[PDB]
Amino acid sequence: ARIAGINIPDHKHAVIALTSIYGVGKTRSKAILAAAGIAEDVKISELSEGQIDTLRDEVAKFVVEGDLRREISMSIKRLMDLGCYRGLRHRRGLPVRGQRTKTNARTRKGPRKP
Amino acid sequence: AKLHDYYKDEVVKKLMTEFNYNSVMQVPRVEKITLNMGVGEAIADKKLLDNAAADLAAISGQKPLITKARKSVAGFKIRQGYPIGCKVTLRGERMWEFFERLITIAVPRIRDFRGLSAKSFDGRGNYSMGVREQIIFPEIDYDKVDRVRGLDITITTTAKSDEEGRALLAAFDFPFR
Amino acid sequence: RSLKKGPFIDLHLLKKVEKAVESGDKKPLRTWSRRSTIFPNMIGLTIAVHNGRQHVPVFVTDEMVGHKLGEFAPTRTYR
Amino acid sequence: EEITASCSCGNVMKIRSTVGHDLNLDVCSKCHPFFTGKQ
């Protein structure tokens, strides 16, 4: 099952096995299995060519895994060439969405740099 | 045999009509294809190279060949004449088989693909490229991984210029941004 | 993400848009306001954003679609 | 040994490969999003 990238998930319920691939999560998984008419309590055992390519076509109706990555990259390049406040915080590693820079921003700032 | 014959008719006539050479032996043909894997972190684990050689003899059909360390350097803490890396040379029928099973079924399983680069030629008509993952070849069971060991490919041809080699590979898919 | 149904723009900046477009590149454009949203008619303009004491000469590029003035001009000198 | 690869593009293609097993694929050289990807 070389679908959507390198992931061959196995022995999972498909409702989580579709979250297992980058760029696709829970609600998208539920909608894909509804559009393919697949029960939630199935396993990846006994899977066929139809059960590959119907899933891949229904997810190829969606933005996945390569162009999403370079879309994030192109948004970041657009903000850096913009030189906005948010672009400056993206380029210098500071929390963008209205946080406090003073205390406890270590997800964005990394570990403590003395 | 397939892409060999595909060359033998279409690429021969295509390149000859492109560059209007004096003769057919003056056309670029692919001469050999070599494959390298630098196993260097096996300075301690002696069988890391042994299993990497099994991996390359699963990718290729033929048994590989180890490489001797040319001259000792302290920059990489190696001794001269050390079990240091493994290569496979390919000519002829297995070479065309490897190119077939490369360009059909391996390039699109590269992680998050976009087309290959342009300036990757030597200048005298050769090509080389390096991979990151290694289940891009089908001969690797996914439950057999033990490192993220990549490898690099060299297509050595008689292209008298890199632009001639570019037009040689434009007869193939050869993604080409 | 914001500004539901019709954005909010400025009176005097809106006037100075026509005061520069219909009357040529006289000067850089001087506003004490940092609010209005960039429309593609404004391409080719030197405007000024005041940061607390000082103006910055903002030029507008094509990909400034839903973007904002003070979003282009931060107001904190660092280090 | 010569095997047969087959992708989702309908491209049934027999090749020599040392897998020792028949093959299922999606993307071939035919019908891959390369030119649509560049666009």
Add this chain to the structure above:
RNA sequence: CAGGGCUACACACGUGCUACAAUGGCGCAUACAAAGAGAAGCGACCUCGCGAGAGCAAGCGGACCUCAUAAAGUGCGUCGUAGUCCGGAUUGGAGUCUGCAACUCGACUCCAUGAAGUCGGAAUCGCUAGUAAUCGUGGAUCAGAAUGCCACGGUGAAUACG
């Protein structure tokens, strides 16, 4: 008067919040309160949007109407020990409503992302019965927010030789 700034950030400490999981998390069916607030206010009912919202207008100066069908709890089916369906930061996009105003700044829905964290060094805090702990809710501030303050309810322990 306009605008920037207490919301900056090489770092330490205090107060707190959410988890690190299986007594847990999920999905479905599911029964049991209190004190509150309300007129420039609360907002049932229906229709569209998966949803956060929009229109209509009943009633209520109030034990009648609104906030509103609270949650752990019980049965079933589940994931069977992993950074896992645990956890939710950070970030891209698309939204909604508020308010002249959301860049310096918010609140929420969704799509996708899934870092460290597998029980915490020396030290340190509370607590004698419906409390310790855990789970919800209401108010005041306000035009908009709570993990903060004030108040209420559900379940509900251990130990005291000294």
Add this chain to the structure above:
RNA sequence: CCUCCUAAAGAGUAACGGAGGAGCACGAAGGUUGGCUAAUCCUGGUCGGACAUCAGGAGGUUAGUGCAAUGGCAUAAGCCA
């Protein structure tokens, strides 16, 4: 004890003259047959880095010769089986 210069183009030639090494190693590093040709730089190439392993080009002994130096070595005295 070995090597160069001082040694004046045969040999040799002193000084508390100027500069260096040896008191070992090898069962292959020896014999033979068949065979190969290095250093350094540039380019391209995943981790990979000024420099590991791959391919090509310039170059053509600057490299190697168990070790100090000198002589010599391509018919190789260097390297592989």
Add this chain to the structure above:
RNA sequence: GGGUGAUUAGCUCAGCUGGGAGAGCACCUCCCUUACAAGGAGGGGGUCGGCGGUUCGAUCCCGUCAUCACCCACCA
């Protein structure tokens, strides 16, 4: 002049017969204390005086230069 040993974190020593830099005091951040010192937990700090070199590679191996310490400098 001449024979012997030494230059290392802020301070003081072992690391030199060749391939990872250790010990003690100090420094910095926490902790108990009304507050220091002592005490308990946790970190980083050198490019081994300098110039050249041999070797794949030097704190270590070799030749000078600056400084320090020691011993000699007798017959007259």
